[PDB]
Ligand binder design. Structure first.
Ligand SMILES: [Cl-]
Ligand SMILES: [Cl-]
Ligand SMILES: [Mg+2]
Ligand SMILES: [Mg+2]
Ligand SMILES: [Mg+2]
Ligand SMILES: [Mg+2]
Ligand SMILES: [Mg+2]
Ligand SMILES: [Mg+2]
Ligand SMILES: [Mg+2]
Ligand SMILES: [Mg+2]
Ligand code: NA
Ligand code: NA
Ligand code: NA
Ligand code: NA
Ligand code: NA
Ligand code: NA
Lengths: 154, 95, 156, 140, 186
RNA sequence: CCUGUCAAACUCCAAACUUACAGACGCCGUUUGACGCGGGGAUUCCGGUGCGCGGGGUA
RNA sequence: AGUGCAAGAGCAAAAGAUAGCUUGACAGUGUUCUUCCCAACGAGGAACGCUGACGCGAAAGCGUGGUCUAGCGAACCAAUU
RNA sequence: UUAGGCGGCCACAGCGGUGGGGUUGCCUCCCGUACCCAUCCCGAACACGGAAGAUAAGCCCACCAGCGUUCCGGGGAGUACUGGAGUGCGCGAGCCUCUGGGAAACCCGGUUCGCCGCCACC
C-alpha cells in the first residue's frame, strides 16, 4: 500500500491524467490518498507518475498523518484514538494504521474521507520539475523518502 | 482522402499475407451463431461475399437474428447504433 | 545553390524513381578507388566518420572524394591502397523555382543521407597513412564535422 | 520387384503440324483411328493470327494400335541416343512420338489421390533404350 | 517449400482427397452428408455431420460386412453398392437421422453409377435425400442383371470359383428382402 | 561466389500505441434520477498559440 | 498467366481457359450499410432477404449483370407501359 | 488405424532423401470392355466388370535436417523506436535524464520430416 500526494496543479495536465487523479479521490494540490498495491491501481499511479509523489510510508508516519489529517466522511471531527475506537473496527489509530498498510481495509470502509488533505511542506519540497532520482520530488519514494515528505506536510 | 469509395484506404486490411492466400476453409463459413452471441468482425480477403463496409473491421457485435444465410449483427459506431449484414465467413466467436 | 537548403533530413524519403522523373545524373565518378583488383588485404584500415545526420549532395560527394583520392597521389597513380565511398545519393531533392501556389518543387538533385557515426569513406593502406591527410581534406568539403578513425592498426 | 518395373508403351502420338487439313485422311490410314484437330495459340506473322483454328492433327494410339503402328514406324527411322527424353521418351520423323513408362503410372493420371511419380520410379533414357532396342532394331 | 511467401494447399487438397469448393456447397444445406465412396473391391457409405474438431459419422455401411447378412458375391458392383446404401441408410434411420445430401467426393456424376446406386439404396432405406430419378440405373442393372447377361457370353465363368457360374441377381433380391425387416445391427 | 547502398506511393519481419467488446477495481448514479428519450431557445461555422506527429516550402 | 479500363485488392480440382446450354442484365417489394465515420441530409450505389416466374446442375446449390471499390442527375413538362 | 473413409488446424504439415510392409480384413498398382457411362482421337481419363500377378509406384510405418517453415535457449539488446514528465544539454539539426513499454536483421545451439477429432476394422 502506497501513499499518494498530488504535487502539481491541474492547469495544463492532460485530461485523462487529471481524471485518474480524480478517481483516486485527490482533487487538489497537497491532497493525499492511500492506495492498494494492485495491478489496476499500479497502472493508475504510473499514469499519474509525473504530478504526484508516492511510496510506502512507515507505520509511524502513517500514524502521525492519520491522527493529524484524517477526516470523517463528513464534518470536523478529529480522528484521534477515541474516535477511531468508538467508530471503527480498530481500538486506536495504530490499529487502523496497521490495517491500512497491510491492506486489510480502507479509509472509506472505516467511515473516513479517502482524502488526507495535507499541509504545504515545512521547508519546501525538492522541486516539481525533477523526479527523486534527479533531486526533485516527483515519482516513487523511499519509505524514508515518503515519510520525510508526509512528515513535512503533517 | 483523394476519393471517397468504400475501399478507400483499405489496402492493408483487405489484403492477405502471402501464405494466407487462396480460398479459405469452409468450416468457418458455415459456423452457426445464436442471437445474443458476441462476434468480432473482420473481413476475409479471400472471401468476396457476405462482406461489410471496411470501416467496421474490428468491431465486436451482438448477433441478433439473421437475414437469408447472412447474420444481422448489432454494433455501435462511435455513439451510433447500427445493424450489420454479414456472413459467418467474416465473423468469429468472442472468447 | 547552398548546402543550407538541403542539408537536413527533415522531409520524407523521396527516392521512388517509378514516381519521379527528370532526375539529374550523379556527379560521382567512382566509388571504388585504388587497387580494386585486390581485396582488403591491408594491415591498416582508416575510415572517415560523419558526426551528425545530414544530407550530402552528390556535389559534395564528388568534391570530397576527388579532393581525397586526387591527393592519395602522394602514393602514385597505381599506388598500393584502396579507397571506398560507401554511400550513394538516393534522396531526390527539389526546388520551387506562382509564388507558393503549386510549390511542390522540381527535381534539381540527389543527396545521400548519412547518419551521425556512419563511415562515409574507408581507406586501406599499409603502414603509410597519407590517407589520414587525404581525409582532412575531404571532410573539408562536406557539411558535418568528422572523426578520422583507424580500425586495424595498433602500429602506433 | 521386376514385372512391375519393366517398361511398356503408353500412347504413340502421330501428328502433322501443318500451318492451316486434307492431311487427316493419311493419318487415319497410317494409324487406324480418327485424327484430332490442332488449334493454335497466339497471333503471328505466318498469316496465322486466328486463335481457334485447325492447324494440323494428331492421333494418340494405345496398346495394340500403338505396337501395330510402331512395327513399321520404327523401321523407317534410324536415329537413337541424344534424341531421347530425360524421361525415356523419344520423337522421330510428320512426327511420331513414343511415350514410355513403368506399370504404376495411373497413380499420376487418375482423379482421386493422384500423385507425381517419384524420380526413382521414373524411366531413364538408358532404361528406355534397352527396352525398345530389345524389340526389333538397334540404338545409336 | 520455396520460400516464406510460398503457399501450401491445405493438407486434404494436397492428398487430392477433398474438393473444398464442392464441400462448401454441400455444407450449405445444413443437413447431414451421405458420403458415397468406392474402392476397387469395396463400396462405403457414411452419414456424416459437422463437428467442432472434424466430421462425425453417425451411421455407416461397408460392402464387406454385407456378407454378414448372407452376401456370397463380389462386392465392387452395382447390387453391392445399392445394398450398402440401403444398409447404411437403415442404421442411419435407427440413428435418428432423417435427411441428407449426397456428397460424391471426387467421383463423377455419371448416370446409373454406383454412387447414385448408393443413393437410391439409402433413400429406399427411409432417408429423405434430394435427388433425380432419371440419373439412377433401371433397377435391373441394380440387381446385377447386366452381369448375369455378361456371363451368358460365357465359355468361361465370369467368377473365378466364387459362387455360381451364371450368377445371381436373385441373390440380390433375397438380400434386400432380408434387410427390410428385423435382423441385428439395423 | 565475393563486395557497396536504398524506399511516402516496397515488405520475410515489427513495436510503443490507438481502437471494438467483456470482466475486475476505481469513480459515478438510484430524495443531487445518472444512461437515455422527447421538446423550446440559442450562440457558432474569420480563430490563434505551445508541445508531439506531421505534408508543402530556402525559409 | 489470365480475369474489358486507373490503382490498389481477390481468384487454381477457380473468380482464369475450353465446350455446351441459357437469358437472374427477370417482375414486385423490402431489410441494412453507404452516400453523409462519429452525427442530420436527397439522387445514386452496394450488401442481404422475401413474393412470383424462370435458367443451369444429380444435388447441395449458384444466378438480385461483369471478382471488388469509378461509369452519375431533383421539380415542372413531354413521350412511352 | 498389419495398410481404410470423412475431416479440423491449414508447411511444426512444404521440398529432398533412406529403410521396412502385405495367401486378405485392407488400399493400391493390376487384368479386362457385354453392359450404365466415356474420349472435339484414344476403356489414358471417366465409367462399369473383375482377380492371373505385384509390393516396384502410390499408400501406411520407422527415420534424416541439406532447403523452406514453427517455436525455444543464449548473444545482438533493454540496443532501434516509443506513451508520460523536465526552467536537463545543444547556435541548431538534434541530444539527455526520469517513468511505463520494447523490436528487426544476423550468429551460435536446440525444436520441427505434423498434431488432433468422428467412423469403420484381427
Ligand atoms: Cl470414392
Ligand atoms: Cl455494412
Ligand atoms: Mg468533509
Ligand atoms: Mg519558508
Ligand atoms: Mg523549488
Ligand atoms: Mg497505410
Ligand atoms: Mg492512428
Ligand atoms: Mg457479384
Ligand atoms: Mg419519352
Ligand atoms: Mg518398397
Ligand atoms: Na485464404
Ligand atoms: Na499564378
Ligand atoms: Na566539415
Ligand atoms: Na439511398
Ligand atoms: Na471442332
Ligand atoms: Na508399395
Amino acid at each position: 500500500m502506497h501513499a499518494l500526494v498530488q504535487l502539481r496543479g491541474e492547469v495544463n495536465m492532460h485530461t485523462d491524467i487529471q481524471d485518474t487523479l480524480e478517481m483516486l479521490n485527490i482533487h487538489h494540490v497537497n491532497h493525499c490518498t492511500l492506495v492498494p498495491e494492485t495491478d489496476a491501481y499500479r497502472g493508475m499511479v504510473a499514469k499519474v507518475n509525473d504530478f504526484v509523489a508516492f511510496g510506502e510510508p512507515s507505520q509511524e508516519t502513517l500514524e502521525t498523518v492519520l491522527a493529524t489529517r484524517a477526516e470523517p466522511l463528513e464534518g470536523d471531527a478529529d480522528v484521534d484514538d477515541e474516535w477511531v475506537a468508538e467508530h471503527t473496527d480498530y481500538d486506536d489509530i495504530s490499529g487502523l494504521a496497521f490495517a491500512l498498510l497491510s491492506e486489510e481495509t480502507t479509509l472509506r470502509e472505516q467511515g473516513l474521507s479517502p482524502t488526507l488533505r495535507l499541509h504545504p511542506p515545512r521547508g519546501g519540497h525538492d522541486g516539481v520539475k525533477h523526479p527523486v532520482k534527479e533531486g526533485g520530488q516527483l515519482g516513487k519514494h523511499d519509505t524514508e523518502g515518503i515519510d520525510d515528505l508526509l512528515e513535512a506536510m503533517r | 482522402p483523394s476519393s471517397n469509395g468504400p475501399l478507400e484506404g483499405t489496402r492493408g486490411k483487405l489484403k492477405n499475407k502471402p501464405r494466407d492466400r487462396g480460398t479459405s476453409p469452409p468450416q468457418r463459413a458455415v459456423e452457426e451463431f445464436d442471437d445474443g452471441e458476441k462476434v468480432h468482425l473482420k473481413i476475409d480477403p479471400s472471401v468476396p461475399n457476405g462482406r461489410f463496409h471496411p470501416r467496421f473491421d474490428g468491431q465486436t457485435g451482438t448477433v441478433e437474428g439473421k437475414q437469408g444465410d447472412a447474420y444481422k449483427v448489432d454494433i455501435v459506431d462511435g455513439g451510433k447504433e447500427k445493424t450489420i449484414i454479414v456472413t459467418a465467413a467474416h465473423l468469429r466467436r468472442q472468447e | 545553390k547552398p548546402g543550407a537548403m538541403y542539408r537536413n533530413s527533415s522531409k520524407p524519403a523521396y527516392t521512388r524513381r517509378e514516381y519521379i522523373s527528370g532526375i539529374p545524373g550523379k556527379k560521382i565518378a567512382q566509388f571504388d578507388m585504388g587497387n580494386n583488383g585486390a581485396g582488403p588485404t591491408y594491415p591498416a584500415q582508416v575510415e572517415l566518420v560523419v558526426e551528425k545526420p545530414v544530407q550530402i549532395r552528390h556535389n559534395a560527394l564528388e568534391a570530397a572524394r576527388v579532393a581525397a583520392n586526387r591527393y592519395v597521389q602522394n602514393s602514385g597513380a597505381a599506388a598500393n591502397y584502396k579507397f571506398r565511398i560507401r554511400k550513394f545519393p538516393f534522396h531526390v531533392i527539389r526546388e520551387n523555382k506562382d509564388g507558393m501556389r503549386a510549390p511542390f518543387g522540381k527535381p534539381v538533385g540527389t543527396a545521400a543521407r548519412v547518419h551521425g557515426a556512419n563511415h562515409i569513406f574507408i581507406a586501406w593502406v599499409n603502414p603509410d597513412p597519407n590517407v589520414e591527410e587525404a581525409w582532412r581534406r575531404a571532410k573539408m568539403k562536406v557539411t558535418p564535422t568528422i572523426n578520422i578513425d583507424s580500425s586495424p592498426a595498433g602500429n602506433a | 520387384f521386376h514385372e512391375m518395373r519393366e517398361p511398356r508403351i503408353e500412347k504413340v502420338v502421330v501428328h502433322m503440324g501443318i500451318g492451316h487439313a486434307n492431311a487427316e485422311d493419311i493419318l487415319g490410314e497410317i494409324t487406324g483411328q480418327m485424327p484430332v484437330r490442332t488449334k493454335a495459340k497466339r497471333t503471328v506473322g505466318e498469316f496465322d493470327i486466328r486463335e481457334g483454328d485447325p492447324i494440323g492433327a494428331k492421333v494418340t494410339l494405345r496398346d495394340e494400335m500403338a505396337e501395330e503402328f510402331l512395327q513399321t514406324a520404327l523401321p523407317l527411322a534410324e536415329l537413337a541416343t541424344s534424341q531421347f527424353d530425360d524421361t525415356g521418351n523419344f520423337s522421330f520423323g510428320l512426327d511420331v512420338t513414343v511415350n514410355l513408362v513403368r506399370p504404376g503410372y495411373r497413380v499420376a493420371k487418375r482423379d482421386k489421390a493422384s500423385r507425381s511419380i517419384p524420380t526413382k520410379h521414373r524411366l531413364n533414357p538408358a532404361d528406355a533404350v534397352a527396352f525398345i532396342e530389345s524389340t526389333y532394331d538397334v540404338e545409336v | 517449400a520455396t520460400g516464406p511467401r510460398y503457399k501450401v494447399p491445405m493438407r486434404r487438397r494436397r492428398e487430392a482427397r477433398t474438393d473444398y469448393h464442392q464441400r462448401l456447397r454441400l455444407l450449405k444445406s445444413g443437413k447431414p452428408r451421405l458420403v458415397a465412396r468406392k474402392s476397387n473391391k469395396h463400396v462405403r457409405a457414411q452419414l456424416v455431420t459437422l463437428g467442432p474438431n472434424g466430421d462425425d459419422t453417425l451411421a455407416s455401411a461397408h460392402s464387406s460386412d454385407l456378407a454378414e447378412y448372407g452376401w456370397e458375391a463380389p462386392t465392387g458392383n452395382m447390387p453391392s453398392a445399392y445394398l450398402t446404401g440401403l444398409l447404411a441408410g437403415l442404421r442411419a434411420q435407427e440413428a435418428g437421422v432423417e435427411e441428407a445430401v449426397l456428397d460424391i467426393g471426387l467421383n463423377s456424376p455419371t448416370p446409373g453409377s454406383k454412387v447414385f446406386a448408393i443413393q437410391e439404396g439409402a433413400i429406399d432405406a427411409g432417408l429423405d435425400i434430394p435427388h433425380n430419378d432419371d440419373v439412377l440405373a433401371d433397377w435391373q442393372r441394380t440387381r446385377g442383371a447386366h452381369i448375369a447377361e455378361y456371363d451368358e457370353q460365357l465359355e468361361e465363368p465370369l467368377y473365378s470359383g466364387d459362387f455360381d457360374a451364371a450368377d445371381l441377381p436373385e441373390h440380390f433380391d433375397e438380400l434386400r428382402e432380408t434387410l427390410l425387416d428385423g435382423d441385428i445391427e439395423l
